[PDB]
Design a protein around this ligand. Sequence first.
Ligand SMILES: CCCCCCCCCCCCCCCCCC(=O)OC[C@H](COP(=O)(O)OCCN)OC(=O)CCCCCCCCCCCCCCCCC
Ligand SMILES: CCCCCCCCCCCCCCCCCC(=O)OC[C@H](COP(=O)(O)OCCN)OC(=O)CCCCCCCCCCCCCCCCC
Ligand SMILES: CCCCCCCCCCCCCCCCCCCC
Ligand SMILES: CCCCCCCCCCCCCCCCCCCC
Ligand SMILES: CCCCCCCCCCCCCCCCCCCC
Lengths: 100, 101, 480, 54, 158
Amino acid sequence: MIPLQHGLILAAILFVLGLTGLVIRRNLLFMLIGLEIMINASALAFVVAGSYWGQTDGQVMYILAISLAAAEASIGLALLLQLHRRRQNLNIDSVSEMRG
Amino acid sequence: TSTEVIAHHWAFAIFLIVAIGLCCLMLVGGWFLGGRALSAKFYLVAMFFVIFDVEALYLFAWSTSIRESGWVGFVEAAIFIFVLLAGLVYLVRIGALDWTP
Amino acid sequence: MTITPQNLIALLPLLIVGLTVVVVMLSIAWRRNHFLNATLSVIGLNAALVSLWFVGQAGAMDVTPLMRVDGFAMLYTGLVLLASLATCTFAYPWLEGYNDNKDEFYLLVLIAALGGILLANANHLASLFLGIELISLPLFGLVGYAFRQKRSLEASIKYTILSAAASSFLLFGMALVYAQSGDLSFVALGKNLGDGMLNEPLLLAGFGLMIVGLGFKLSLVPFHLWTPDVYQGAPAPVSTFLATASKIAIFGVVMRLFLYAPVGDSEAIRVVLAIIAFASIIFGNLMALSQTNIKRLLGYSSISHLGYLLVALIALQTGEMSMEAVGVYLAGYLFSSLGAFGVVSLMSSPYRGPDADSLFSYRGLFWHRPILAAVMTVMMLSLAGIPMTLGFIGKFYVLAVGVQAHLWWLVGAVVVGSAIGLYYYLRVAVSLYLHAPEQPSNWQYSAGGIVVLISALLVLVLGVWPQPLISIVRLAMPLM
Amino acid sequence: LLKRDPLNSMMNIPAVLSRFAGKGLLLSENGYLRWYVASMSIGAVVVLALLMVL
Amino acid sequence: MEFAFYICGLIAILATLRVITHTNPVHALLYLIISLLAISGVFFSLGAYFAGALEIIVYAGAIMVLFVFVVMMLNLIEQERQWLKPQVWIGPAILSAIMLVVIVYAILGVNDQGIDGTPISAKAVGITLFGPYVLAVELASMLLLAGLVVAFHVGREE
Ligand SMILES: CCCCCCCCCCCCCCCCCC(=O)OC[C@H](COP(=O)(O)OCCN)OC(=O)CCCCCCCCCCCCCCCCC
Ligand SMILES: CCCCCCCCCCCCCCCCCC(=O)OC[C@H](COP(=O)(O)OCCN)OC(=O)CCCCCCCCCCCCCCCCC
Ligand SMILES: CCCCCCCCCCCCCCCCCCCC
Ligand SMILES: CCCCCCCCCCCCCCCCCCCC
Ligand SMILES: CCCCCCCCCCCCCCCCCCCC
């Protein structure tokens, strides 16, 4: 009764919202937050695709996606803690000296 | 859709809204009535909780279908839990799970 | 399908690398011994190579709905394992200079080798996604292993953020493809489309998002800007492992995906990949023109060489020798980048600390270390495509595959980018034999030295005499 | 009129073009992570539009 | 089931829109938790009961707890509000809008027989996970071990 198209469009909306939140923010924490939004949107799209076909594979890919999201959130917050404890500044544009 | 399942859906929804409304009304009556006049170990503990929670979800999914998975599934969960215990042992011996050094 | 005992006899490198991970981790939990843990890592990788020989005694079979093992998979597994062994060998003097925990580097290197093996045997979208994450996140650890170093922390943050974004793009594309196809197997990606309806927009857009993620992973233009910063900031053995193992494993699974997907011979994806290959070759060669940093220059070089690989990939279904060309090119590129980033590793070893500069200064290298200057020159000529080297044999293979498929724009791009490459590679080599104005004693440094000399001897011998490697790659046919 | 080899200069013109193009392309490697993410999204837009056109 | 799906999707979209524009980190994380709860409600509308339970348990109950922990220990760019003035988000917003319109053009035009909403239980997901998905499970434990090792190596104090 629910269209697959509507669930896919909802996942796409959340994905592009996470992408623009990733781009527009100088603070690294909001960049990590936008990354979490994008990966949650991708997992939602996999759930919609799996539930449309009546298959278990969508929830399995969802489980793999949230395992990835947990590990990436852990690593990114470790890197953010390192940046804050070595520079006392979460500005990502200051971490830019390698260029050319 | 049986009558019992929609009765239970209605009961669950009413349970939700009565609980939330009771708490909100409790705080509303509290405010409206009366007379006016860190170390990195926290991050590591939360991170360990997240990782072992995802492993716990895999074990959750195994546990509900033991009779439909056979001894092969037991072996699969055996290497899974062995790697989990190896990681836990690793964290214990390196001092990661040691609040007091 | 389920698992048989013979399926376990078609799974040994994965199990060997995983058991090496567990054993090294428990040995770290016992004590913090750099020598013993590094040795356990290299014995585990060597045993995985011997396990590859043992499964070469066995046949080719589909071990899961996920995995498929054939000679294609064994060839790419061997390339990944050789890259990992070289990385550990270069990492030991570097980690000897590193005044912190050292064996976690080996644990992450082994875990990334496991992900490379998974990508080498992947026949399924779930396995491809898992292998990509399994080579990516240990590289998050390894690129910023020296997180107190400001350049390494910068490279770690850049690679972590950008690879998380690319993983999101790839996962979203996989979800859209599964929404269309209804099956995550490689062979079913377009099976439910017939009568010329192969160009369905949802399948194409899903493959486009996967192309964005994979082309980030392959340093393809315009997902390439991370490459010089991440290459320069990362530790030099980590740069070696990234440039060799990650790109080889991801391009192998991309080769398999475009081989068994029925949507692989759509004209739209072929045209988009042709544009990406053209831009990658030209942009990498042009951007490496005025580089005085060897690591950034090798990043741009990696962009151009993956453009050549993409040119070989486009001629898959039209031609026949495309996968053989990819194998020969991957062997030559593996040995060349191994030797190049190996010299970068040993001259930057031991690790001098987070505050000291890691500048290379290759000018005048002959007058204080002649043999490493000779090996750097040999690999510079190999990446240029000089006929006395196996890099030319790969260039000749991709040129033959572009001529056979009449990809004349890509052939002209190869020639022009080759000329620009000649300029900057020969500048690097003649700088090695220039005069420097002004400016070890172990056996693991000598092990890294003999590794880069062995790679030079292999690239020179297979440049003059390429037939053994050609016959090695040719027998590695997959289950068609 | 022909003491400075004009044909040599006209054949050396592609080297000048290559140097100019490389110097122009190196400006996009400014080192900003936000621009790297922006360029990834721009390339995603270009790839998706090209695939939808064909 | 359609009613709950549409309200939860709308709540998730609205909460994400408040997430990417807010200035306070704790408030943004609270809106992100709200969006995760809405996404779990969407999962329960589709019949993926295990996915909704996992969206509350693992995403809102573990990962966002980690983000919240990091923000509290930071005790935290905020003052100028760069992302609010149109001269900063003029480009990225229309870029994301173009990407979204191309993606939803690809979405519109596919076979859509509708979602039945029949519950795919966690038992069947477990049978699949511990049937034809052995290497996904073992290598996912492997991946989480890798992430744990990386995050301890980077995030410890010393
Ligand atoms: C007659 C027409 C039909 C036949 C055509 C045949 C084509 C192949 C044979 C002709 C090739 C001509 C190449 C001309 C440039 C040769 C290289 C050169 O002059 O390099 C010198 C110059 C470096 O000078 P320097 O001042 O030291 O640099 C600044 C830093 N110190 O270097 C530089 O500034 C950078 C050099 C970059 C690499 C060289 C340029 C390559 C361009 C593509 C070449 C392929 C052919 C394209 C079409 C050519 C015209 C038809
Ligand atoms: C009221 C107007 C809006 C007011 C403001 C927003 C309030 C919250 C709105 C979202 C949550 C409630 C949505 C409405 C649910 C009502 C019940 C319902 O529709 O149940 C249908 C279905 C029953 O299950 P099934 O067996 O599939 O039945 C289908 C036909 N027999 O149900 C299902 O299949 C699943 C039922 C939903 C999933 C469980 C509940 C999720 C709750 C998510 C909360 C998110 C955070 C909210 C934050 C609010 C503040 C911003
Ligand atoms: C009915 C009685 C059955 C007895 C034998 C049961 C076990 C047989 C099959 C064993 C399969 C083991 C699979 C292990 C996979 C490990 C993967 C590790 C990846 C790193
Ligand atoms: C096919 C490979 C061709 C290049 C080989 C490079 C290594 C050869 C062995 C070392 C030779 C060094 C010669 C240095 C000469 C320096 C002369 C300076 C004064 C004019
Ligand atoms: C900036 C560097 C640009 C390099 C461009 C190199 C171009 C080389 C020449 C390509 C010629 C292609 C001709 C194609 C003809 C196809 C005819 C088809 C007939 C059916």
